[PDB]
Design a protein around this ligand. Structure first.
Ligand code: HC4
Length: 124
């Protein structure tokens, strides 16, 4: 249905969704495996970043797609949460690789499905 950015049970709602449904979200949604490889990437995210969602699948988010996020402030928090098993964290960030510098709010949250982690993004 409608689901809001930052919802307490967002991972429950998104677990139920196909590509088209993920594409209809109000916010960018990326699913990563524990190594940061991109499993899913929705249309809303591509509208923020200019990436083609169909072609970033399989790439590594931190190494290749989003090098500006390779930092203790973003990637560091991702890996801490993958390790702890309790990934659920929110912060502001600026995305600026091969796009106009864009201020965003990011929410990372463990998925219900195996070896899966969400990165949610909205403009601020
Ligand atoms: C910094 O390099 C961020 C880049 C970026 C963030 C999010 C995406 O979906 C794509 C590229």
């Amino acid at each position: 249905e409608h689901v809001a950015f930052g919802s307490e049970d967002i991972e429950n709602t998104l677990a139920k969704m196909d590509d088209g449904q993920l594409d209809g979200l109000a916010f960018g949604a990326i699913q990563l495996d524990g190594d940061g490889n991109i499993l899913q990437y929705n249309a809303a995210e591509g509208d923020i970043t200019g990436r083609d969602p169909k072609q970033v699948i399989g790439k590594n988010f931190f190494k290749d797609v989003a090098p500006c996020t390779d930092s203790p402030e973003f990637y560091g928090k991702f890996k801490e949460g993958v390790a702890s098993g309790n990934l659920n964290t929110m912060f502001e960030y600026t995305f600026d690789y091969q796009m106009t510098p864009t201020k965003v709010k990011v929410h990372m949250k463990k998925a219900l499905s195996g070896d899966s982690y969400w990165v949610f993004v909205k403009r601020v």
